[PDB]
């Protein structure tokens, strides 16, 4: 990963990604989300991320 003043960007679209297999992973120090309940993430469609 690059430095904070050169934080890396990437665009993501046209996928089929399941966040349940990603949410339950315990290898994360913190997984807190704003304005979106993680458990419902599987039932939404996004223009891009």
């Amino acid at each position: 990963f690059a430095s904070v003043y050169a934080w890396n960007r990437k665009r993501i679209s046209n996928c089929v990604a399941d966040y349940s297999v990603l949410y339950n992973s315990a290898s994360f120090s913190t997984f807190k989300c704003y304005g979106v309940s993680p458990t419902k993430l599987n039932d939404l469609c996004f223009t891009n991320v």
Binding site: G35, V36, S37, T39, K40, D43, L44
Partner: protein, 49 residues
């Protein structure tokens, strides 16, 4: 038969009633300080707290 605009009172009453009802139904889409102006999506995108 020839000259119109003689029945102003009834037309004004009808116009006032229609205007009141139309603005009442218009007021339904206002944000009112929330994040979205629809009940179903905001219920399907968040948790109760």
């Amino acid at each position: 038969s020839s000259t119109a605009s003689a029945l102003g009172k009834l037309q004004d009453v009808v116009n006032q009633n229609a205007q009141a009802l139309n603005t009442l139904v218009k007021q339904l889409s206002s944000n009112f300080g929330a994040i979205s102006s629809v009940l179903n999506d905001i219920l399907s995108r968040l948790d109760p707290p």
